[PDB]
Design a protein around this ligand. Structure first.
Ligand SMILES: O=C(/C=C/c1cccnc1)NCCCCC1CCN(C(=O)c2ccccc2)CC1
Ligand SMILES: O=C(/C=C/c1cccnc1)NCCCCC1CCN(C(=O)c2ccccc2)CC1
Lengths: 463, 463
């Protein structure tokens, strides 16, 4: 992996564009105003791509050779890169401060800043805006995931009386759904920050590898059928497969796609009559989690429950919402995203069903269908030293005041009302709102401070 | 990278959910019924994740351990995995036939298929469903980008008269916006199949590494300004900044953002007056490319052009559309996706403007913002051999008969009307619509057939 060619091409040409006599280029990152975001993931990109010796004779030469063909000219700054190579044995001469991983900071706040520690590397700061900006992703997943949690929390509480198994309500299916493998990892981790139910094994490694979990492994998973494992017995032997999968895994909790063919038959005939004996005989610690993924998450859950409440002994819980016997539960495989999640869950409430009966699972929406647009994650330059004297820089397009960028040296502070506040123009040095909450996490190619995935949990915690 | 950990979790439990005595699991990939897709991406996946020795006692042991704690039990099949390590020196006993990379195959056709070559590894086929399925991305990005190419070609022709510069009308600005690093590589590579303008350096490397290019410039890019390189000069020195960039790159086409502060000032005054002499004196082979980046993408382009035509000598090309002097062009790099693209270009026409004047730029929408959902990319099983008996498998969910699944062995064919037709139930053997268009591309861990990015290009070509 070469960092020399891991940025947006035109930046390779920025070094010549900054005012002459520029010693410092201070840049920050924020989710311009989902009122609060989970800041998570920077630590990953810092260890995997930024720390250590990132420059090498071979990497400086590879760059030139490419940018030579790419730009049909030698625009590439081999001069400046080669400088970093010798002067600091390839380590990047930049400082990066940030809010502790997992922090839930409201929109408009400085989550992390990047600046060059060596005056000649005034071009490095923004060079890495790209590589570093891709954190918008894990942050977004992390945020959106955590928002879907509150929705399940709000409704589980005002329906069951508590939050048992909350952390296992949104299961990550999106492994096949993501754009790449690496993404599968990163995204899976921005979920395990809010729930422990994940099928995208990848996100786990990353965690143990870049964040470390003292707990017994990050997320988990129960065995489950897929369309191939049931359609393979032939449409006529669907029963044979259902009964083979609940028996093979009579052991632990098993999930079984019941919509291969008429989801409402499988529920009313196969599970509620033929294999009635393999359900009721089950353990509460290992129920048969019926799983449809046919059409319209709301109407199906309701009808599924309706059918099941009818072939099985339903009970009314402390709050009045109907509840299936401990050996029968349901998971919403398809159509679930932060928006529909809200529909289904409230749709159940109106229908008196308890959010207990059902646990959900989102694929693409959960790990894809996310953009740097959603939370307005942006990396803009606010401070710069031109000729020994700094100047507060920022952009303010006319056709868009929403795109005004902060100006000057920034600092994150807790306000007397408990919330946060991002101070600009260096005013954070007036000793006003306590200490800056951002922490130097990166300086001269060496991770100066990291958090464990267990810490990220505690930070991103709800309520 | 351990292939034994690149699959949905439940699939780890799958091996024991198939009917007893199943020697063959054969599945297919299709873009369930964007009327035609570009099949691109399989070749990379095969090469980077499935080729060669993908199994090692170390990777089996790792999985074992991880999986054991994941499912809090050992449902992990090391016996069958261990089998492959021995029998075929860690090489996957599976065969994958597919359509030539770049193939613009309509919708509802079998693009690629998979099946285990060893009756012992019947379970293996689906295992890698996840791995393979992630191709929806490269397919989708190569497909969506191509569609946008059409909208561009369509109006460029009906406005300039030809298709010159077409392959540079959509510059990839999404490196900043993709979910991860590995994504930008894949994404950008799918874009480059349809255009040659990309700032996502990453993609090029992947091409030369997994597809190879004999061509000179597999991906081109000119120097450009970014907000930091301008705003750093201070609001009151935007002119100083503009005049500095045009000078540094007076010889080559240089793009320069102008919405730092008032896009309509930098155009009517900064470039139209204070620095006119620096634009009009430029080579056509190195124009100044004015680039707005905020405001209504259409309203802005028109006013931008309206200002420029009012400050520079505009001509009227044959077709009757207005055209700016050869040294002055516009690059619309914000808010451009297939929809808006189609609105702008269309809006430029009603307003008598040649698509020659503008060149677009998309990022988030181009590479990110696409889902396995869009083209209905799906991988399902359609044929299996149980007790030496082949059965045509399929799912036909009610409440969404649109998720139906083809049945039996498939083959791609070209119908006498020139288009394509996917044959099911093994009816392809009746040898009627010529030979199967699918070529075996992967046998027992060996790429038996790949295509140069030059061929893919020729396949994905338009008209
Ligand atoms: O194996 C699959 C993966 C399916 C899939 C499908 C498609 C793509 N990719 C993966 N299982 C689905 C997650 C099961 C995890 C837990 C088990 C324990 N559990 C309950 O006991 C329960 C209690 C109350 C309410 C609901 C459930 C909550 C849910
Ligand atoms: O390099 C950037 C990068 C912007 C950016 C933004 C955000 C993030 N990352 C990067 N933007 C401008 C580069 C486009 C270069 C090509 C040169 C050849 N060309 C024309 O000569 C022309 C002919 C006719 C009409 C229009 C143009 C078409 C445009």
């Amino acid at each position: 992996f070469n960092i020399l060619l891991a940025t947006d091409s035109y930046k390779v040409t920025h070094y010549k564009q900054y005012p002459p006599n520029t010693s410092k280029v201070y840049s920050y990152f924020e989710c311009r105003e989902y009122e609060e975001t989970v800041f998570y993931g920077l630590q990953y990109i810092l260890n995997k791509y930024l720390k250590g010796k990132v420059v090498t004779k071979e990497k400086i030469q590879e760059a030139k050779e490419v940018y030579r063909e790419h730009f049909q000219d030698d625009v590439f700054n081999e001069r400046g890169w080669n400088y970093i190579l010798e002067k600091y044995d390839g380590h990047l001469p930049i400082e990066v401060k940030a809010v502790p991983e997992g922090s839930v900071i409201p929109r408009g706040n400085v989550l992390f800043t990047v600046e060059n520690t060596d005056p000649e590397c005034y071009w490095l700061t923004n060079w890495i805006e790209t590589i570093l900006v891709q954190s918008w992703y894990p942050i977004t997943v992390a945020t959106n995931s955590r928002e879907q949690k509150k929705i399940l929390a709000k409704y589980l509480l005002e329906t069951s009386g508590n939050l048992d198994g909350l952390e296992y309500k949104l299961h990550d299916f999106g492994y096949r759904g993501v754009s790449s493998q690496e993404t599968a990892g990163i995204g899976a981790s921005a979920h395990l920050v809010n729930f422990k139910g994940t099928d995208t094994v990848a996100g786990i490694a990353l965690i143990k590898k870049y964040y470390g979990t003292k707990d017994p492994v990050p997320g988990y998973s129960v065995p489950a059928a897929e369309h191939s494992t049931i359609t393979a017995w032939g449409k006529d032997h669907e029963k044979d497969a259902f009964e083979h999968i609940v028996t093979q895994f009579s052991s632990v909790p098993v999930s079984v796609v019941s919509d291969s063919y008429d989801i409402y038959n499988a529920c009313e005939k196969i599970w509620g009559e033929d294999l009635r004996h393999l359900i009721v005989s089950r353990s509460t610690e290992a129920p048969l989690i019926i799983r449809p993924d046919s059409g319209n998450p709301l109407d199906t859950v309701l009808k599924v429950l309706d059918i099941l409440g009818k072939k099985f002994p339903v009970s009314e819980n402390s709050k009045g919402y109907k509840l299936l016997p401990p050996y029968l539960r349901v998971i919403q495989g398809d159509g679930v995203d932060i928006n529909t999640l809200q529909e289904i869950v409230e749709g159940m409430k109106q229908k008196k069903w308890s959010i207990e009966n059902v646990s959900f699972g989102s694929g693409g929406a959960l790990l894809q269908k996310l953009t740097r647009d959603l939370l307005n994650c942006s990396f803009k330059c606010s401070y710069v030293v031109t000729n020994g004297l700094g100047v507060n820089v920022f952009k303010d397009p006319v056709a868009d005041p929403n795109k005004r960028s902060k100006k000057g040296r920034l600092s994150l502070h807790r306000t007397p009302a408990g919330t946060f506040v991002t101070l600009e123009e260096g005013k954070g040095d007036l000793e006003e709102y306590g200490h800056d909450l951002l922490h130097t996490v990166f300086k001269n190619g060496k991770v100066t401070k990291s958090y464990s995935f267990d810490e990220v949990r505690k930070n991103a915690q709800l309520n």
